[PDB]
Design a protein around this motif. Structure first.
Motif, PDB file in Angstrom:
ATOM      1  N   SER A  98       0.826  -1.211   0.000  1.00  0.00           N
ATOM      2  CA  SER A  98       0.000   0.000   0.000  1.00  0.00           C
ATOM      3  C   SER A  98       0.866   1.270   0.000  1.00  0.00           C
ATOM      4  O   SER A  98       2.048   1.217  -0.358  1.00  0.00           O
ATOM      5  CB  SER A  98      -0.993  -0.045   1.182  1.00  0.00           C
ATOM      6  N   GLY A  99       0.254   2.408   0.332  1.00  0.00           N
ATOM      7  CA  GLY A  99       0.942   3.586   0.818  1.00  0.00           C
ATOM      8  C   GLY A  99       1.752   4.288  -0.256  1.00  0.00           C
ATOM      9  O   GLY A  99       2.945   4.511  -0.072  1.00  0.00           O
ATOM     10  N   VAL A 100       1.101   4.671  -1.351  1.00  0.00           N
ATOM     11  CA  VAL A 100       1.658   5.537  -2.393  1.00  0.00           C
ATOM     12  C   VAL A 100       1.017   6.929  -2.272  1.00  0.00           C
ATOM     13  O   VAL A 100       0.723   7.597  -3.266  1.00  0.00           O
ATOM     14  CB  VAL A 100       1.474   4.882  -3.776  1.00  0.00           C
ATOM     15  N   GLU A 101       0.679   7.326  -1.043  1.00  0.00           N
ATOM     16  CA  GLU A 101      -0.177   8.466  -0.779  1.00  0.00           C
ATOM     17  C   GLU A 101       0.501   9.765  -1.210  1.00  0.00           C
ATOM     18  O   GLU A 101       1.733   9.846  -1.274  1.00  0.00           O
ATOM     19  CB  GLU A 101      -0.583   8.463   0.705  1.00  0.00           C
ATOM     20  N   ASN A 102      -0.334  10.770  -1.474  1.00  0.00           N
ATOM     21  CA  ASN A 102       0.032  12.123  -1.876  1.00  0.00           C
ATOM     22  C   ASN A 102       1.004  12.786  -0.893  1.00  0.00           C
ATOM     23  O   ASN A 102       1.224  12.314   0.231  1.00  0.00           O
ATOM     24  CB  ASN A 102      -1.242  12.981  -2.002  1.00  0.00           C
ATOM     25  N   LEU A 103       1.505  13.955  -1.296  1.00  0.00           N
ATOM     26  CA  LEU A 103       2.422  14.772  -0.531  1.00  0.00           C
ATOM     27  C   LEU A 103       1.696  15.235   0.732  1.00  0.00           C
ATOM     28  O   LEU A 103       0.492  15.473   0.713  1.00  0.00           O
ATOM     29  CB  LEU A 103       2.911  15.917  -1.448  1.00  0.00           C
ATOM     30  N   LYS A 104       2.408  15.384   1.850  1.00  0.00           N
ATOM     31  CA  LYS A 104       1.902  16.104   3.007  1.00  0.00           C
ATOM     32  C   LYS A 104       2.836  17.254   3.317  1.00  0.00           C
ATOM     33  O   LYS A 104       4.042  17.211   3.057  1.00  0.00           O
ATOM     34  CB  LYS A 104       1.676  15.171   4.199  1.00  0.00           C
ATOM     35  N   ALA A 105       2.268  18.310   3.876  1.00  0.00           N
ATOM     36  CA  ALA A 105       3.011  19.456   4.342  1.00  0.00           C
ATOM     37  C   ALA A 105       2.441  19.828   5.699  1.00  0.00           C
ATOM     38  O   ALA A 105       1.225  19.902   5.867  1.00  0.00           O
ATOM     39  CB  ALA A 105       2.973  20.578   3.304  1.00  0.00           C
ATOM     40  N   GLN A 106       3.320  20.000   6.684  1.00  0.00           N
ATOM     41  CA  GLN A 106       2.950  20.392   8.026  1.00  0.00           C
ATOM     42  C   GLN A 106       2.842  21.919   8.060  1.00  0.00           C
ATOM     43  O   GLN A 106       3.751  22.613   7.593  1.00  0.00           O
ATOM     44  CB  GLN A 106       4.018  19.870   8.992  1.00  0.00           C
ATOM     45  N   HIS A 127       1.016  23.246  13.265  1.00  0.00           N
ATOM     46  CA  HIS A 127       1.520  21.884  13.301  1.00  0.00           C
ATOM     47  C   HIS A 127       0.501  20.844  12.841  1.00  0.00           C
ATOM     48  O   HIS A 127       0.796  19.651  12.951  1.00  0.00           O
ATOM     49  CB  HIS A 127       2.199  21.530  14.638  1.00  0.00           C
ATOM     50  N   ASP A 128      -0.645  21.249  12.283  1.00  0.00           N
ATOM     51  CA  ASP A 128      -1.496  20.317  11.546  1.00  0.00           C
ATOM     52  C   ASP A 128      -0.722  19.756  10.359  1.00  0.00           C
ATOM     53  O   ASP A 128       0.255  20.345   9.886  1.00  0.00           O
ATOM     54  CB  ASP A 128      -2.780  20.974  11.013  1.00  0.00           C
ATOM     55  N   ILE A 129      -1.193  18.623   9.853  1.00  0.00           N
ATOM     56  CA  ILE A 129      -0.622  17.904   8.733  1.00  0.00           C
ATOM     57  C   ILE A 129      -1.691  17.900   7.660  1.00  0.00           C
ATOM     58  O   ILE A 129      -2.799  17.414   7.905  1.00  0.00           O
ATOM     59  CB  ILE A 129      -0.231  16.487   9.206  1.00  0.00           C
ATOM     60  N   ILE A 130      -1.370  18.461   6.496  1.00  0.00           N
ATOM     61  CA  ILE A 130      -2.316  18.635   5.412  1.00  0.00           C
ATOM     62  C   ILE A 130      -1.872  17.732   4.276  1.00  0.00           C
ATOM     63  O   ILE A 130      -0.693  17.729   3.915  1.00  0.00           O
ATOM     64  CB  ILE A 130      -2.406  20.131   5.034  1.00  0.00           C
ATOM     65  N   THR A 131      -2.823  16.980   3.733  1.00  0.00           N
ATOM     66  CA  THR A 131      -2.700  16.185   2.529  1.00  0.00           C
ATOM     67  C   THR A 131      -2.618  17.190   1.389  1.00  0.00           C
ATOM     68  O   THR A 131      -3.624  17.791   1.045  1.00  0.00           O
ATOM     69  CB  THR A 131      -3.938  15.271   2.446  1.00  0.00           C
ATOM     70  N   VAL A 132      -1.426  17.447   0.861  1.00  0.00           N
ATOM     71  CA  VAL A 132      -1.243  18.226  -0.350  1.00  0.00           C
ATOM     72  C   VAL A 132      -1.859  17.434  -1.500  1.00  0.00           C
ATOM     73  O   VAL A 132      -1.812  16.207  -1.499  1.00  0.00           O
ATOM     74  CB  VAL A 132       0.257  18.494  -0.581  1.00  0.00           C
ATOM     75  N   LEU A 133      -2.446  18.118  -2.479  1.00  0.00           N
ATOM     76  CA  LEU A 133      -3.162  17.476  -3.569  1.00  0.00           C
ATOM     77  C   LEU A 133      -2.895  18.149  -4.914  1.00  0.00           C
ATOM     78  O   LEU A 133      -3.041  17.483  -5.939  1.00  0.00           O
ATOM     79  CB  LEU A 133      -4.676  17.510  -3.293  1.00  0.00           C
ATOM     80  N   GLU A 134      -2.529  19.434  -4.955  1.00  0.00           N
ATOM     81  CA  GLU A 134      -2.159  20.137  -6.189  1.00  0.00           C
ATOM     82  C   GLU A 134      -1.367  21.394  -5.808  1.00  0.00           C
ATOM     83  O   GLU A 134      -1.425  21.815  -4.651  1.00  0.00           O
ATOM     84  CB  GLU A 134      -3.432  20.486  -6.993  1.00  0.00           C
ATOM     85  N   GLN A 135      -0.649  22.006  -6.751  1.00  0.00           N
ATOM     86  CA  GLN A 135       0.232  23.145  -6.535  1.00  0.00           C
ATOM     87  C   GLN A 135       0.073  24.142  -7.679  1.00  0.00           C
ATOM     88  O   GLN A 135       0.557  23.902  -8.786  1.00  0.00           O
ATOM     89  CB  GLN A 135       1.703  22.704  -6.450  1.00  0.00           C
ATOM     90  N   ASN A 183       2.100  29.084  -5.920  1.00  0.00           N
ATOM     91  CA  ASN A 183       2.427  29.240  -4.510  1.00  0.00           C
ATOM     92  C   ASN A 183       1.305  28.680  -3.651  1.00  0.00           C
ATOM     93  O   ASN A 183       1.573  28.125  -2.590  1.00  0.00           O
ATOM     94  CB  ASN A 183       2.584  30.726  -4.157  1.00  0.00           C
ATOM     95  N   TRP A 184       0.059  28.862  -4.084  1.00  0.00           N
ATOM     96  CA  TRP A 184      -1.105  28.294  -3.436  1.00  0.00           C
ATOM     97  C   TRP A 184      -1.147  26.814  -3.753  1.00  0.00           C
ATOM     98  O   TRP A 184      -0.994  26.457  -4.917  1.00  0.00           O
ATOM     99  CB  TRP A 184      -2.365  28.987  -3.942  1.00  0.00           C
ATOM    100  N   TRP A 185      -1.360  25.952  -2.766  1.00  0.00           N
ATOM    101  CA  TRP A 185      -1.472  24.512  -2.921  1.00  0.00           C
ATOM    102  C   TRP A 185      -2.863  24.120  -2.485  1.00  0.00           C
ATOM    103  O   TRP A 185      -3.402  24.720  -1.554  1.00  0.00           O
ATOM    104  CB  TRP A 185      -0.421  23.802  -2.067  1.00  0.00           C
ATOM    105  N   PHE A 186      -3.453  23.146  -3.162  1.00  0.00           N
ATOM    106  CA  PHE A 186      -4.694  22.558  -2.731  1.00  0.00           C
ATOM    107  C   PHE A 186      -4.303  21.472  -1.748  1.00  0.00           C
ATOM    108  O   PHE A 186      -3.386  20.695  -2.035  1.00  0.00           O
ATOM    109  CB  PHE A 186      -5.411  21.996  -3.959  1.00  0.00           C
ATOM    110  N   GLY A 187      -4.976  21.381  -0.607  1.00  0.00           N
ATOM    111  CA  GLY A 187      -4.819  20.231   0.253  1.00  0.00           C
ATOM    112  C   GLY A 187      -5.922  20.119   1.290  1.00  0.00           C
ATOM    113  O   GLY A 187      -6.668  21.068   1.525  1.00  0.00           O
ATOM    114  N   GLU A 188      -6.008  18.948   1.909  1.00  0.00           N
ATOM    115  CA  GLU A 188      -7.106  18.507   2.741  1.00  0.00           C
ATOM    116  C   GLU A 188      -6.584  18.153   4.130  1.00  0.00           C
ATOM    117  O   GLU A 188      -5.635  17.383   4.290  1.00  0.00           O
ATOM    118  CB  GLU A 188      -7.821  17.331   2.059  1.00  0.00           C
ATOM    119  N   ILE A 210       6.934  21.122   3.277  1.00  0.00           N
ATOM    120  CA  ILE A 210       6.889  19.704   2.929  1.00  0.00           C
ATOM    121  C   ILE A 210       7.647  18.943   4.008  1.00  0.00           C
ATOM    122  O   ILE A 210       8.667  19.423   4.519  1.00  0.00           O
ATOM    123  CB  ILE A 210       7.503  19.471   1.528  1.00  0.00           C
ATOM    124  N   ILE A 211       7.166  17.735   4.260  1.00  0.00           N
ATOM    125  CA  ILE A 211       7.686  16.766   5.200  1.00  0.00           C
ATOM    126  C   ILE A 211       8.247  15.608   4.363  1.00  0.00           C
ATOM    127  O   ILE A 211       7.742  15.378   3.257  1.00  0.00           O
ATOM    128  CB  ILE A 211       6.547  16.265   6.125  1.00  0.00           C
TER     129      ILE A 211
END
Length: 74
Positions: A6-14, A32-40, A43-48, A63-64
């Motif tokens: 498993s575990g090919v997950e998207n970028l995360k950024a703290q 210090h939340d951890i956001i699932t980056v999804l697009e860039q 400068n603005w990134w989409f993430g969840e 990025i982490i």
């Protein structure tokens, strides 16, 4: 499933500081939340993070690499 690591997950950024949303399409995080980056964009990134989705200037985050050798939040 019989195999497959498993575990090919998207970028995360703290997030480095808390930032409430403003627009509709703006993300909302805490420091210090951890956001699932999804697009860039430029400068603005989409993430969840915590069920939103939205956009945010990446300058508020870093990025982490991996969650490596620290916690294992099972």
């Amino acid at each position: 499933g019989s195999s497959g690591s498993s575990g090919v997950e998207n970028l995360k950024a703290q997030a480095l500081c808390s930032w409430t949303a403003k627009k509709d399409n703006h993300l909302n995080f805490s420091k210090h939340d951890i956001i699932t980056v999804l697009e860039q964009q430029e400068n603005w990134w989409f993430g969840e993070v915590h069920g939103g989705r939205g956009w945010f200037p990446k300058s508020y985050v870093k990025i982490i690499p991996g969650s490596e050798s620290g916690p294992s939040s099972g």
